[PDB]
Design a binder for this molecule. Structure first.
Ligand SMILES: [Zn+2]
Ligand SMILES: [Zn+2]
Lengths: 149, 149
């Protein structure tokens, strides 16, 4: 499994979020700048096979990571989706939610050339990971369980 | 708001699921047969504006309704998605999750002519509502809080 492999560090992946049961990883072949996948660490074939507690916490992680990404890449919108079955477009059979950023215009200048739907240069993953992590950390400081400003 | 209106019975909508805080309604201009929208009754502009408890329960309702729809229309797959912002395709600003059925071939014979992305004839809504409700009721009987077979 591609995701179980990334979780176990057997396959390369850039984490932007991680806790004991969940993680968010940059998509290797991003549809748009900042495209990220949020996944439960435990392996479930799809959304319908996951227990309610996992789905409930997954929804909360998706919110946090989405807020973080929107802030980091200054997105005007976000598309959230998960596919169940090959006829619905599922190709990785480990439950994951896509967070695909959108803009009414063009993405920030701070970001350089981007090749939609293809593998990017190493620099892309390193920068996106760092800025997204920075945005998420701030969200934990102003709206986290131990927020203070 | 189109969804608040449907919830308050001020605007026509076919419910396939409903409880004190959530509801699932057939999409009026379905992308595919059985296309349904799951919504929290309370009004939230999008996914990011909803509190964690609402998102957690929403995820659970989405699972139940999805299982029900897949069974009812004998789908091979399902696409689940929610849009945040007009640039991501959002047009109804009341948080809702799309459940769009897919098939590797064609949908069941029991179903007649279907016009993708357009308003269907009254018969479509009446039949889909009835079969989906029937499937959901069964799910509550075999895997519900008071299941027994
Ligand atoms: Zn896996
Ligand atoms: Zn509303």
């Amino acid at each position: 499994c591609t995701f179980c492999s990334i979780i176990n560090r057997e396959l390369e992946g850039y984490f932007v979020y991680e806790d004991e049961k969940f993680a968010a990883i940059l998509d290797k072949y991003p549809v748009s700048l900042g495209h990220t996948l949020v996944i439960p660490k435990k392996h479930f074939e799809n959304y319908l096979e996951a227990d309610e507690d996992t789905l409930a916490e997954l929804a909360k992680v998706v919110k946090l990571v989405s807020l973080g990404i929107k802030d980091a890449v200054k997105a005007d919108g976000l598309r959230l989706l998960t596919n169940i079955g090959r006829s619905a477009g599922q190709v990785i059979f480990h439950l994951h939610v896509h967070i695909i950023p959108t803009w009414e215009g063009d993405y920030p200048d701070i970001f350089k050339s981007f090749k939609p739907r293809k593998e990017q240069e190493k620099e892309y993953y390193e920068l996106l990971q760092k800025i997204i992590r920075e945005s998420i950390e701030n969200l934990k400081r102003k709206i986290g369980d131990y927020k203070w400003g």
